[PDB]
Amino acid sequence: GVAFEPSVFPSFSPISIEESPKLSEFELEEDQAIPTSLSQISLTNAILNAMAEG
């Protein structure tokens, strides 16, 4: 509550979210948008957390 530090957070794309190790453990629908939807929602969620912390 006085000082700060410059951190960084990585964001995966649509091709990296479906190529994970334990990605098939969840009941995800392959017919609908699940890989591209989870990657696009993570970019807006990480930008909101970085703007609030900044």
Residue 22 touching another protein (CB under 8 A): yes
Task: Count the residues of the shown chain that bind another protein, applying the rule CB under 8 A.
Answer: 10
Q: How far apart are CA 54 and CA 49, in angstroms?
A: 8
Q: Rounded distance, CA 33 to CA 6, Å?
A: 34
Q: Which one among 11, 13, 15, 19 touches another protein, defined by CB under 8 A? A: 19
CB nearer to another protein: pick between 11 and 20? 20
Residue ranges that bind another protein, judged by CB under 8 A: 18-19, 21-22, 24-28, 48
